[PDB]
Amino acid sequence: SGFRKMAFPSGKVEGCMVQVTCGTTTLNGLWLDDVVYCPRHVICTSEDMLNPNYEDLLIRKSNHNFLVQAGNVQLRVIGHSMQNCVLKLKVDTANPKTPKYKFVRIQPGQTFSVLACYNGSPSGVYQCAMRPNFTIKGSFLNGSCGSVGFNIDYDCVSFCYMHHMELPTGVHAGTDLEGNFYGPFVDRQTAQAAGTDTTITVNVLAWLYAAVINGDRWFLNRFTTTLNDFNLVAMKYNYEPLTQDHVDILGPLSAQTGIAVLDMCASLKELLQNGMNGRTILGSALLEDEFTPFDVVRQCSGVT
Amino acid sequence: SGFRKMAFPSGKVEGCMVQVTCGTTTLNGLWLDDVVYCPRHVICTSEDMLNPNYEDLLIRKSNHNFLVQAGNVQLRVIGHSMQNCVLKLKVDTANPKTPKYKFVRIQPGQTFSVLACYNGSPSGVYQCAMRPNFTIKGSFLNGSCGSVGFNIDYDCVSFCYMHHMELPTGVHAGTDLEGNFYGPFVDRQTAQAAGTDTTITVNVLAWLYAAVINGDRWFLNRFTTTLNDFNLVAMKYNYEPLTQDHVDILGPLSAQTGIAVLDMCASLKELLQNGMNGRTILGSALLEDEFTPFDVVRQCSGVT
Ligand SMILES: Cc1ccnnc1NC(=O)Cc1cccc(Cl)c1
Ligand SMILES: Cc1ccnnc1NC(=O)Cc1cccc(Cl)c1
């Protein structure tokens, strides 16, 4: 009973967080095995951020300039290298708390948990989606850079995001763990266009299935639609076009509830065209797109 | 930049979760020092739940009937006792992962994080509020009983909730860690009235301050109100009456933003009387009441 925006338990990731300081800049690092990963802009001052030449800035730094700490543990840095927008600091000690992990590059529309950290200390955890425009709408203040996003499958942590910056619009941008930005962004203090975002249609449909499973059913109607007709409505309302691949991933939810995917599309079409009429679905007064079909199945079956 | 429904990092609590089995019933337990706490209904079968005599049911159980496990660790039970609706199983080994902790009974309207668990394994973490009617709207399935709610201050975990049951309405009920139910509930399979709930006014005001801090300002108006006038509106809309104690706790937010508490009350009055007009505040199309003033200050200042 009930359906919440749930994050993965963060313990496995808390055990990896360290503080990285270079010069006057302090941010968060991720310590896995004998490597600490952090945003490369840890080597910048404020005047450097307007147009940094990272290669030149990194040449002025030595291993001993990177101060890495995790409470009472000071780590000894024995190597440093830049990979895209991340620095990899080789340390002489493998993190005893390294969980089983992978580095993955997620697709837009996928969800993950963020462990917000400041000065290497975890402050909170929340679930969010990678927007179709490759930004995230997180909660990040100065010092949160280097905080990571992840998913967990059994005992394996798949790290997918490292936070780098806030755009002038207040949305967030960052990289995969190889330092490649999601989206067109660069790690520089210049105004940068995020570009047109859309609503993640397959996730809204998944959430409407979660709603029916939990008893919110008022939006079910006597109609059906086609992918073509639904996509005309999706276009008008800035929703992602629905494909057969999306219909296929909704298969388990359609099978469990007995509501055909195109019939749920007709409920979504009617909600887009008429609004909520002052009612709510799973405690929301808008159409929620931060739950994937996999998230809904996981939460509705009690997977650990 | 940004404001999210953030949970506390759950690692300290994940280290305390165990599975407790008695007979055919399995649920979650909390292992702190050399005691495991769990709902007393672990001793019931399904036929017992309609009207259990817990004292009699517990008399048929011995220490060796309580199977406690945490992965590869089987705990040896050397004592058992019932305290209100919880069982306390004394074990021969102190949990090496016991964090600094306290047991607290929270007030209605306060928030906390829940680590949803099944069979002793954490599945997810979310933040919620204790409703004014002493229920929570969580996400709990069969086997989640014994999952706990908590807050964290520095390195100290204050455990405030243990989940016991879902009401026929799909809302959740549970106890403090001394086994006293929040609200009028009893641990029996009987339909039980939750009673009239209200919206947590001070939390909505705190969240409107979080909104102004993060740039959502469209709801600010040229008006002011009084506590008396505001409370007539609060009454009409089933909001908790606002008191000077609530105004006092909003003081830091009023000081930071320069918006007097009664001026924010006039914005809230106008939103109650006119609705959102199809707009959003911090990504919500309704007035959010699951952030306390302390939560807003914590999140807006980046506290770890
Ligand atoms: C102040 C802040 C808030 C939220 N997230 N990040 C934050 N820090 C920054 O954006 C700092 C920064 C400035 C230019 C480029 C880059 Cl890569 C980083
Ligand atoms: C099935 C389920 C879902 C969510 N939360 N809890 C759940 N279990 C129960 O409510 C089981 C139960 C039945 C009667 C009394 C008591 Cl104390 C417990």
SS3 string, chain B, reads CCCCCCECCCHHHHCCEEEEEECCEEEEEEEECCEEEEEHHHHCCCCHHHCCCHHHHHHCCCHHHEEEEECCEEECEEEEEEECCEEEEEECCCCCCCCEEEECCCCCCCEEEEEEEECCEEEEEEEEECCCCCCECCCCCCCCCCCEEEEEECCEEEEEEEEEEECCCCCEEEECCCCCECCCCCCCCCCCCCCCCCECHHHHHHHHHHHHHCCCCCCCCCCCCCHHHHHHHHHHCCECCCCHHHHHHCHHHHHHHCCCHHHHHHHHHHHHHHCCCCCCECCECCCCCCCCHHHHHHHHHCCC
Which residues, numbered 236 to 265 in chain B, qualify as contacts with chain A under a Cβ-Cβ cut-off of 8 Å?
none
**Catalytic-role residue among B44, B85, B128, B145:** B145
B18 interfaces chain A, CB cutoff of 8 Å: no
Indicate whether residue B140 lines ligand 2 (CB < 6 A).
yes
Q: By C-alpha distance, which of A99, A96, A84, A79 is closest to A150?
A: A99
CB atoms within 10 A of CB B22: 24
Distance CA A86, CA A54 (A): 11
- DSSP annotation of A93 reads S
Contact by Cβ (8 Å): B85, B43? no
Nearest residue on chain B to A153, alpha-carbon basis: B123
Distance CA A149, CA A176 (A): 9
CB atoms within 10 A of CB B248: 13
CA of A187 to the centre of ligand 1 (A): 9
CB pair distance less than 8 Å for A9 and B170: no
Residue to mutate among A6, A152, A199, with most B CBs inside 10 A, is A6
Helix (H, G, I), strand (E, B) or coil at A287: coil
Ligand 1 proximal residues by C-beta, below 6 Å: A 41, 49, 140-142, 144-145, 164-166, 172, 187-189; B 1
Burial of B5 (0-12, 13-18, 19+ CB in 10 A): buried
B115 interfaces chain A, CB cutoff of 8 Å: yes
- Which value in Å is the resolution of this experimental model? 1.3
Distance CA B245, CA B261 (A): 12
Phi and psi angles of residue A208, each rounded to the nearest 5 degrees, phi first: -65, -35
Phi and psi angles of residue B198, each rounded to the nearest 5 degrees, phi first: -135, 165
Using a CB-CB cut-off of 8 Å, the residues of chain B touching A154 are: none
Q: By C-alpha distance, which of A150, A156, A176, A153 is closest to A164?
A: A176
| Bridge partners for A11 per DSSP | none
Nearest residue on chain B to A152, alpha-carbon basis: B123
Q: By C-alpha distance, which of A217, A240, A214, A242 is closest to A229?
A: A242
CA of B184 to the centre of ligand 2 (A): 16
Distances (CA, A) of B191 to A147, A215, B17, B51: 45, 18, 30, 12
For chain B, first and last CA: distance in Å?
17
CB pair distance less than 8 Å for A125 and B286: no
Backbone angle region of A200, left / alpha / beta, with phi > 0 → left and psi within -120 to 50 → alpha? beta
Distance CA B147, CA A302 (A): 13
Phi and psi angles of residue B22, each rounded to the nearest 5 degrees, phi first: -140, 120
Helix (H, G, I), strand (E, B) or coil at A266: helix
Domains of chain A: 1-14+100-197 (2.40.10.10), 15-99 (2.40.10.10), 198-301 (1.10.1840.10)
CA distance B223 to chain A (A): 25
CB pair distance less than 8 Å for A304 and B280: no
- DSSP annotation of A284 reads B
From the CA of B189, give the closest atom in ligand 2: 14
| Bridge partners for A67 per DSSP | A21
Which residues, numbered 163 to 202 in chain A, qualify as contacts with chain B under a Cβ-Cβ cut-off of 8 Å?
166, 170-172
Q: Could you tell me whether strands B156-166 and B148-153 are parallel, antiparallel, or unpaired per DSSP bridges?
A: antiparallel
CA of A168 to the centre of ligand 1 (A): 10
Number of H helices, E strands in chain A: 8, 13
Contact by Cβ (8 Å): A140, A124? no
- Token reading at A194: 């995020």
Contact by Cβ (8 Å): A271, A188? no
- DSSP annotation of A281 reads B
Distance CA A39, CA A30 (A): 10
Q: Could you tell me whether strands A100-103 and A156-166 are parallel, antiparallel, or unpaired per DSSP bridges?
A: parallel
Distance CA A288, CA B284 (A): 10
Q: Could you tell me whether strands A156-166 and A148-153 are parallel, antiparallel, or unpaired per DSSP bridges?
A: antiparallel
What percent helix, strand, coil does chain A show, rounded to 5?
A: 25, 30, 45
CA distance B299 to chain A (A): 8
